[PDB]
Short mmCIF file of C-alpha atoms and ligand atoms in Angstrom, two decimals:
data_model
loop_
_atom_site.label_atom_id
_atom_site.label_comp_id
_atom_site.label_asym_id
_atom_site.label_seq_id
_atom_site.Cartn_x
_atom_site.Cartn_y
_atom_site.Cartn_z
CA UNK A 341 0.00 0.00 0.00
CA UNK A 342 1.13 3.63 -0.63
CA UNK A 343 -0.18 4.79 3.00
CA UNK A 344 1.24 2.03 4.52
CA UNK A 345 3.58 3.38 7.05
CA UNK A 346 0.56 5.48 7.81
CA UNK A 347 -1.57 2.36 8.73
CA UNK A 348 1.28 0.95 10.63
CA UNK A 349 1.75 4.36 12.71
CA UNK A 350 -2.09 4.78 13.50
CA UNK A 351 -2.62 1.11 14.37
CA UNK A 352 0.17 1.63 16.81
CA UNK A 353 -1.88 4.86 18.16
CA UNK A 354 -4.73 2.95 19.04
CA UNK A 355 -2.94 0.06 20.55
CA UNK A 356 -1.05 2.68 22.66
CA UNK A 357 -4.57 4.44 23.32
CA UNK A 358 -6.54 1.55 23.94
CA UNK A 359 -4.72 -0.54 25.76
CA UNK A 360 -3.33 2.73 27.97
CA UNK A 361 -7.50 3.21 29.37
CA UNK A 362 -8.91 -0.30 29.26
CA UNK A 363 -8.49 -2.76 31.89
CA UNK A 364 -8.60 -6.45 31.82
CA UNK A 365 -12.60 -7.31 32.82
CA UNK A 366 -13.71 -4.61 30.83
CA UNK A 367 -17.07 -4.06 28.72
CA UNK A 368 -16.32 -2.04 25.91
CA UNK A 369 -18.86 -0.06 23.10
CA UNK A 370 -17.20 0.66 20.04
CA UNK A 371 -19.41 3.00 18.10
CA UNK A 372 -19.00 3.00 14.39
CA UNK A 373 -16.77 -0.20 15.16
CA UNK A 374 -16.49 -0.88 11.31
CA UNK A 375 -14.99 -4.25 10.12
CA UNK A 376 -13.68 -4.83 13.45
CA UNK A 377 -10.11 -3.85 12.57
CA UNK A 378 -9.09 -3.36 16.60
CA UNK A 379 -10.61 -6.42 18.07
CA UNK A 380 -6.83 -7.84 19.13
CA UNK A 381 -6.30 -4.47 20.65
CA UNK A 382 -8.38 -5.08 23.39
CA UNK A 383 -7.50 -9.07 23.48
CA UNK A 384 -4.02 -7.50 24.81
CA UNK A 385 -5.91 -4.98 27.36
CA UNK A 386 -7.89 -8.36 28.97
CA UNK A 387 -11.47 -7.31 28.19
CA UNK A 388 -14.40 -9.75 28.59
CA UNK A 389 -17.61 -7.98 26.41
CA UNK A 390 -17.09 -6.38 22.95
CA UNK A 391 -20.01 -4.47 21.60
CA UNK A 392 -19.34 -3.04 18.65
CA UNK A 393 -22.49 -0.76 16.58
CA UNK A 394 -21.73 0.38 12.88
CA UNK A 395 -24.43 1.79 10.71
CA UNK A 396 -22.97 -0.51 7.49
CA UNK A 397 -24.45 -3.70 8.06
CA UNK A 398 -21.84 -4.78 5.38
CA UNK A 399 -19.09 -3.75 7.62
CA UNK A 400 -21.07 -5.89 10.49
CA UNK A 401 -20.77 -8.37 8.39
CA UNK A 402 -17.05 -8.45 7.58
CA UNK A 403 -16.90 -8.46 11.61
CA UNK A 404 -18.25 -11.11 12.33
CA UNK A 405 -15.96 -12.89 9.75
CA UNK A 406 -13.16 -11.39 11.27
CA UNK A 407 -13.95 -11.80 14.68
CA UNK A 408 -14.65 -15.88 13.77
CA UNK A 409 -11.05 -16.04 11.75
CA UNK A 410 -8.80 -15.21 15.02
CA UNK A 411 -7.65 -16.85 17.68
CA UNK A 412 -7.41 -16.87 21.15
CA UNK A 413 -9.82 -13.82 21.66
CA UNK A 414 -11.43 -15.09 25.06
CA UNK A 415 -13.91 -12.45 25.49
CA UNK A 416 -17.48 -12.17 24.19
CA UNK A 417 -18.69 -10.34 20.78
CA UNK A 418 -21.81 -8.38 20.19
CA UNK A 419 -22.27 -6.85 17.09
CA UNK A 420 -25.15 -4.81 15.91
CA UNK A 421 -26.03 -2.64 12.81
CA UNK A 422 -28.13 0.55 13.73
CA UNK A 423 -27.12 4.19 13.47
CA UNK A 424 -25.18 5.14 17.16
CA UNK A 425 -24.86 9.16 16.79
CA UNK A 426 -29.25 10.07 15.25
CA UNK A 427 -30.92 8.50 17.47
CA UNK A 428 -30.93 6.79 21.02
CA UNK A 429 -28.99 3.41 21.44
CA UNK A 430 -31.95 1.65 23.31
CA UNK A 431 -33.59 -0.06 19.87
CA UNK A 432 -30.62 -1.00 18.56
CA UNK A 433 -29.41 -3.14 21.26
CA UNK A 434 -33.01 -4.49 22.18
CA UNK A 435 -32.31 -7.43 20.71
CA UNK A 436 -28.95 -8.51 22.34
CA UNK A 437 -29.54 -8.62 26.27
CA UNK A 438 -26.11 -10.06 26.34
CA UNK A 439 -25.24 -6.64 26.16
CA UNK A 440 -23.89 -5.66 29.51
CA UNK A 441 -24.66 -1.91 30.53
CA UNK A 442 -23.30 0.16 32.18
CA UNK A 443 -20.27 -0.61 30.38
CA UNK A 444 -16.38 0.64 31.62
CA UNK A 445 -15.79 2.07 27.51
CA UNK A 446 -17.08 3.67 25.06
CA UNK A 447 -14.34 4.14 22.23
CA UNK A 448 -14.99 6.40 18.67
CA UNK A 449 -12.43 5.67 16.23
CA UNK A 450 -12.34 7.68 13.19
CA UNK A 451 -15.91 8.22 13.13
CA UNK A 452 -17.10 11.03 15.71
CA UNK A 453 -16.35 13.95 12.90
CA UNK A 454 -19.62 11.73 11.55
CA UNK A 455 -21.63 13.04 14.20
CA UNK A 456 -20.90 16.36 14.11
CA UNK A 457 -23.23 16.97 11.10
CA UNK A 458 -25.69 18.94 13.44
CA UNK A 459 -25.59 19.97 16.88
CA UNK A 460 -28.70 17.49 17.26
CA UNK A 461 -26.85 15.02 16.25
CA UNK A 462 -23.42 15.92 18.26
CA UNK A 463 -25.32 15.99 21.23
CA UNK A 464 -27.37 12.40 21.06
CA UNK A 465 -23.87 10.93 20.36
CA UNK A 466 -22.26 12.14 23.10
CA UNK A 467 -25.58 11.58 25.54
CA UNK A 468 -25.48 8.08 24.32
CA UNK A 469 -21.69 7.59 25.11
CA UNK A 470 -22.38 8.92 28.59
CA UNK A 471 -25.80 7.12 29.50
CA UNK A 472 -23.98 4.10 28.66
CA UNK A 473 -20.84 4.59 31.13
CA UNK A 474 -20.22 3.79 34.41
CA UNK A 475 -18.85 6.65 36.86
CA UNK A 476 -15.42 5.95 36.30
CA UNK A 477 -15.75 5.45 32.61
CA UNK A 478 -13.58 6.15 29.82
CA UNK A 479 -14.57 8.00 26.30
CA UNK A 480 -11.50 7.88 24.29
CA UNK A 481 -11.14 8.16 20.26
CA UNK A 482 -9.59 9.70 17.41
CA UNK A 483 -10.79 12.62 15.52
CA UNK A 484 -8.95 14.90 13.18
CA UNK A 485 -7.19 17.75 15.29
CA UNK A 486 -9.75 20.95 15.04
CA UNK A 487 -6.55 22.99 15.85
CA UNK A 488 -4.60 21.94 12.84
CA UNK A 489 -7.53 22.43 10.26
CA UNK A 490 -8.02 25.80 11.45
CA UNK A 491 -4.01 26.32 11.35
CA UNK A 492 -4.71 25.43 7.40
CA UNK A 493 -7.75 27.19 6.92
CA UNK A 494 -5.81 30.35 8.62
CA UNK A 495 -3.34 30.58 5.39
CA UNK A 496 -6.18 31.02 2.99
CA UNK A 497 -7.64 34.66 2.00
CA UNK A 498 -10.83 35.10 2.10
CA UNK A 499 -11.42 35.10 -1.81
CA UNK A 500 -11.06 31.53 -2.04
CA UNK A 501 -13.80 29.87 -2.36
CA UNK A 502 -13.26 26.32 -1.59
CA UNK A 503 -10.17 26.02 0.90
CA UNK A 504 -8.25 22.72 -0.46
CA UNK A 505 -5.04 21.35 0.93
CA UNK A 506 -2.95 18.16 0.57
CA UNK A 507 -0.01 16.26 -0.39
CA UNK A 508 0.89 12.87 -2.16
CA UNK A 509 -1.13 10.50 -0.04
CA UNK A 510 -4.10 13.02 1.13
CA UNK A 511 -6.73 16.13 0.33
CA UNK A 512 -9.23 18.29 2.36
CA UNK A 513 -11.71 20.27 0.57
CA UNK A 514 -14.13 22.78 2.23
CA UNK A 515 -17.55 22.76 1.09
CA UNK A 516 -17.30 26.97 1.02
CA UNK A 517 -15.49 29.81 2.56
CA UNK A 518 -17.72 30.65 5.14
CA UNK A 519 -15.16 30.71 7.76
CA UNK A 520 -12.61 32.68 6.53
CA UNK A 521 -15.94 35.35 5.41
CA UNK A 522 -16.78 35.22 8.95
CA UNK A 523 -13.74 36.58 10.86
CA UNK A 524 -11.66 33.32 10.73
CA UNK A 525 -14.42 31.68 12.98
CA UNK A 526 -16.56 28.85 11.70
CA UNK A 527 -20.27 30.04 11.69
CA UNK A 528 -21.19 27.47 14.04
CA UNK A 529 -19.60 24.07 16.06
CA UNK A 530 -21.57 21.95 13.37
CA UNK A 531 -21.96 21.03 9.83
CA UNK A 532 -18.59 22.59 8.65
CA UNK A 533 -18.11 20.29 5.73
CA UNK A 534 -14.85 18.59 4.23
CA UNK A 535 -14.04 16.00 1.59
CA UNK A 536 -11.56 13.99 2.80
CA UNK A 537 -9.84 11.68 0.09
CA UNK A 538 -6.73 9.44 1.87
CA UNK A 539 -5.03 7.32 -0.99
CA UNK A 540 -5.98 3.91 -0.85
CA UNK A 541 -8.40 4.43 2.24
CA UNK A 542 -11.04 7.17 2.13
CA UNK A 543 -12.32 7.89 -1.27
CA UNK A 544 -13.83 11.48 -1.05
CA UNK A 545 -15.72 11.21 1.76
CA UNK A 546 -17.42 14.37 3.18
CA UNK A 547 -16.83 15.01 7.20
CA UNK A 548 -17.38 17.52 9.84
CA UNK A 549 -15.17 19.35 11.47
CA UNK A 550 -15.13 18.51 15.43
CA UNK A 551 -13.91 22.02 17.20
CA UNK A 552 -11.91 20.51 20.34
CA UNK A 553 -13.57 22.84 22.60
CA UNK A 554 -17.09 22.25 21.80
CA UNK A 555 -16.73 18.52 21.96
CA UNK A 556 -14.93 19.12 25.38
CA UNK A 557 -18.19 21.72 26.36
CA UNK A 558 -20.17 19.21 25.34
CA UNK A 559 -19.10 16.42 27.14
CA UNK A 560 -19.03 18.38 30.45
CA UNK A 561 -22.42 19.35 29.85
CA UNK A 562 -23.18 15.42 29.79
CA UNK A 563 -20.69 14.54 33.02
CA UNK A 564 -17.27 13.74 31.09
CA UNK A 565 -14.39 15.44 32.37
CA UNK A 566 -11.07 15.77 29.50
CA UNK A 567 -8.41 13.30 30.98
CA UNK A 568 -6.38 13.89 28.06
CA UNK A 569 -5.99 15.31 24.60
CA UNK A 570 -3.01 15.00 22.30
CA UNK A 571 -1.96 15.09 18.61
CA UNK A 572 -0.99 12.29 17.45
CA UNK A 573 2.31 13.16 17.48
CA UNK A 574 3.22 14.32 20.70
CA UNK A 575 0.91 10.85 21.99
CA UNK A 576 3.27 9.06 19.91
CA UNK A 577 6.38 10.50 21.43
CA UNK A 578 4.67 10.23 25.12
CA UNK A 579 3.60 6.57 24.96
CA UNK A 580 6.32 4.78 22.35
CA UNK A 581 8.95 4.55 25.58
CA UNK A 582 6.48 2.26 26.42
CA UNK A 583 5.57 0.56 23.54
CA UNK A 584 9.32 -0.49 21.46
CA UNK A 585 10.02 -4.05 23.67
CA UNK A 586 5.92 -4.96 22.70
CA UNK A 587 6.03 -4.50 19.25
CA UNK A 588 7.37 -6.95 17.13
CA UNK A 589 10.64 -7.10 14.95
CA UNK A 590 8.66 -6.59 12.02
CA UNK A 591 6.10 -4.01 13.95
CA UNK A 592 9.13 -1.63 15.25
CA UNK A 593 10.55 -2.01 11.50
CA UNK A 594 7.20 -0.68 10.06
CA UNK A 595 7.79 2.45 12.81
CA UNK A 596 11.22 3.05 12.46
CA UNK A 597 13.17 5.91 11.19
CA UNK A 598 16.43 5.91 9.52
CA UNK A 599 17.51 7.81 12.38
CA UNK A 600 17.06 5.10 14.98
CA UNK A 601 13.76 6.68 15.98
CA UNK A 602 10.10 5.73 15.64
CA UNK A 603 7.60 7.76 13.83
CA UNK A 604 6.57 8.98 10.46
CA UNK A 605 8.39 11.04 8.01
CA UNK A 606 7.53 13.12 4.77
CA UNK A 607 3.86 13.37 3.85
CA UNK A 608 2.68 11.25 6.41
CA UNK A 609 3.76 12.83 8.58
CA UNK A 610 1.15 15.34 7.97
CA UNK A 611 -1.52 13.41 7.00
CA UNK A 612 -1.30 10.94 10.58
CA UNK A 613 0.88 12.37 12.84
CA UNK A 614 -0.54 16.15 12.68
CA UNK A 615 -3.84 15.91 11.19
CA UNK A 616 -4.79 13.43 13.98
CA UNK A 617 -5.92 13.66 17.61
CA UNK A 618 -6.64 11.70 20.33
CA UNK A 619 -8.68 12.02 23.35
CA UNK A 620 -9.68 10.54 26.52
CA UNK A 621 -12.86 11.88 28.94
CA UNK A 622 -13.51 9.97 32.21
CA UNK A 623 -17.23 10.02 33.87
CA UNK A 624 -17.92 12.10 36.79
CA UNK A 625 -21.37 11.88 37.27
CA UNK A 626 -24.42 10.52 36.25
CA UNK A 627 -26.68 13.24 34.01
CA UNK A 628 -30.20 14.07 34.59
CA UNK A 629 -31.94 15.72 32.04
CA UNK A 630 -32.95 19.38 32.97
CA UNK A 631 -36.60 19.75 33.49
CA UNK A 632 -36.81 15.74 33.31
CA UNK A 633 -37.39 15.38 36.98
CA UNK A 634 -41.46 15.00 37.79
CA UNK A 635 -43.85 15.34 40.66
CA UNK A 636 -45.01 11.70 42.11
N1 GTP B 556 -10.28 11.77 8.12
C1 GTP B 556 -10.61 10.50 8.23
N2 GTP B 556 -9.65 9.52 8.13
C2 GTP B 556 -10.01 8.22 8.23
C3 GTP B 556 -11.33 7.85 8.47
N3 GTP B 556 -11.35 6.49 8.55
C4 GTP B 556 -10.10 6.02 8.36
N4 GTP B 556 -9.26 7.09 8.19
C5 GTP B 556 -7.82 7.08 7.93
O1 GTP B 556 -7.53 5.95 7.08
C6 GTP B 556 -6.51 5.14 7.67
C7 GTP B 556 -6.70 3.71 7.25
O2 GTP B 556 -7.87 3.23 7.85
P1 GTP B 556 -8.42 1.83 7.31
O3 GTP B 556 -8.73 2.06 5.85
O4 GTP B 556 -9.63 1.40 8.07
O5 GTP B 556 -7.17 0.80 7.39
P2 GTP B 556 -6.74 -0.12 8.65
O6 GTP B 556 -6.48 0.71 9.88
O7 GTP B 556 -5.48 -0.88 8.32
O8 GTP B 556 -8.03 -1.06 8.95
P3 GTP B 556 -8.23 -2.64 8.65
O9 GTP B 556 -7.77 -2.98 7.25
O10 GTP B 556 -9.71 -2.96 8.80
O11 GTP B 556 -7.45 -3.46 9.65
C8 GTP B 556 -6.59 5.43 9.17
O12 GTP B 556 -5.42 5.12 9.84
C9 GTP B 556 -6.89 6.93 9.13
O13 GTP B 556 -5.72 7.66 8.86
C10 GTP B 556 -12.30 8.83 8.57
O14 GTP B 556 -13.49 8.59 8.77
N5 GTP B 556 -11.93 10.15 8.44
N1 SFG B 557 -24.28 7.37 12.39
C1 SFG B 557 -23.43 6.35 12.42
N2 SFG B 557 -23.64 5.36 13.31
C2 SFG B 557 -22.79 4.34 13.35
N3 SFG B 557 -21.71 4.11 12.61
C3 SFG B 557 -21.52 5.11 11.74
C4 SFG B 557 -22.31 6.23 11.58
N4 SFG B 557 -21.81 7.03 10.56
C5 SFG B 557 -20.74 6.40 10.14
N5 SFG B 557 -20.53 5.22 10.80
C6 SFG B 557 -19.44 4.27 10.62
O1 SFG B 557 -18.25 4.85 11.09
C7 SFG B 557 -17.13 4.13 10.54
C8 SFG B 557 -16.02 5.10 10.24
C9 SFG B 557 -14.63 4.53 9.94
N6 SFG B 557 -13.83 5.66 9.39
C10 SFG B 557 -13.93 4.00 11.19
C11 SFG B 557 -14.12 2.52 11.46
C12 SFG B 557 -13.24 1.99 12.60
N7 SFG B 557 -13.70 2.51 13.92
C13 SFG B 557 -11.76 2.32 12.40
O2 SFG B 557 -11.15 2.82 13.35
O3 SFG B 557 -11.25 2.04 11.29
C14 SFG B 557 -17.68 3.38 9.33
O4 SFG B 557 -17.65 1.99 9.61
C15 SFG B 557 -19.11 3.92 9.18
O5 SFG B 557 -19.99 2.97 8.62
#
């Protein structure tokens, strides 16, 4: 693959942020879970319940193929196809009581920015990720860094009309130039559109931007304090001390540097080590809706 020392770097940023919040025991929701790509993640962190939701019942599909091609996974699999950010999580998982809620989990990787179509929508994500926690919880996921695409969008005058940056392996176009028309603010949190095209992954797929702060207002509205947020990069440079004698030979050769060090060099290091965050919210108290509290 051209993006392959890409794959390699963000598949070692989600073992490193997975396996850094989950415990062994653990019952895990992975929204948008896709074709189950980090089920031996969290075979490594000990967990015992998988539920993973994707809106592509095709993708559920190639799960559940996955899932029954591997080996020594010893904890249970629940996989469901509904739609986890527009609506309420209580349908789809009516029909797997297996399903153990409150769960200690809830992980979004690569797929949040999905949610962040409307502020409706933004909100009944992040109300589902917290009804379903325990206090105590972790939220953690990957989202592209609303810092660094407003770094980009920064360099653009306001005559352009469609913002558009890239390299080699990866493009962003903005629907419009509504931000750069409005001050250098976005108009609002939500529906601030992108096509995002990644060479041999993502084929011009429109997004939303995710604004750090509003997710992090957000959450606290819903009882999630930030634990942590980091660019890929500096995560990478945190957690690798860590990481080197776990990896593989042929893992640490797919991270390496001619230099001796691990990372990513030339365009991706751009397109995953900058355009990338992660984050990590912890549970702090249960949320009650306002006005939700009746008489007798
Ligand atoms: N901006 C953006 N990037 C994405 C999204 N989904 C995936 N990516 C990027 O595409 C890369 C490749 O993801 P995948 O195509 O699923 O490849 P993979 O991680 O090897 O997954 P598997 O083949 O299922 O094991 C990721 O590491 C991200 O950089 C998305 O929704 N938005
Ligand atoms: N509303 C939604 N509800 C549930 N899943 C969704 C929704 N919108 C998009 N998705 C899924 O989100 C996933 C996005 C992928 N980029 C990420 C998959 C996987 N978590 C990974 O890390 O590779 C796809 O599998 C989509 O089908």
């Amino acid at each position: 693959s051209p993006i392959i020392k890409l794959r390699n770097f963000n598949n070692a940023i989600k073992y490193m942020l997975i396996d850094k919040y989950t415990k062994p025991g653990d019952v895990v929701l992975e929204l948008g879970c896709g074709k189950g790509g980090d089920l031996r993640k969290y075979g490594a962190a000990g967990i015992s319940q998988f539920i993973g939701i994707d809106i592509s019942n095709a993708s559920i599909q190639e799960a559940h193929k996955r899932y029954r091609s591997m080996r020594n996974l010893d904890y249970q699999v629940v996989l469901i196809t509904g739609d986890c950010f527009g609506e309420s999580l209580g349908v789809a998982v009516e029909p797997f009581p297996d399903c153990r809620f409150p769960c200690d989990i809830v992980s979004t990787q690569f797929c949040l920015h999905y949610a962040f179509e409307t502020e409706e929508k933004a909100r009944r994500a992040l109300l589902n990720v917290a009804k379903s926690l325990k206090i105590g919880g972790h939220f953690f996921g990957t989202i592209p860094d609303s810092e660094f695409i407003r770094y980009k969008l920064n360099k653009f005058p306001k005559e352009v009309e469609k913002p558009s940056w890239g390299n080699s392996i990866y493009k962003v176009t903005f629907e419009n130039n509504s931000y750069q028309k409005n001050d250098y603010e976005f108009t609002s949190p939500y529906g601030q559109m992108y096509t995002y095209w990644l060479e041999d992954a993502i084929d011009n797929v429109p997004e939303y931007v995710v604004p750090f702060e509003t997710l992090r207002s957000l959450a606290d509205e819903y009882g999630l304090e930030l634990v942590s947020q980091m660019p890929f990069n500096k995560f990478f440079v945190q957690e690798i001390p860590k990481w080197i004698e776990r990896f593989s030979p042929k893992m640490r050769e797919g991270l390496q540097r001619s230099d001796g060090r691990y990372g990513v060099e030339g365009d991706e290091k751009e397109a995953a080590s900058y355009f990338y965050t992660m984050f990590a919210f912890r549970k702090v108290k249960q949320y009650i809706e306002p006005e939700s509290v009746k008489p007798n």
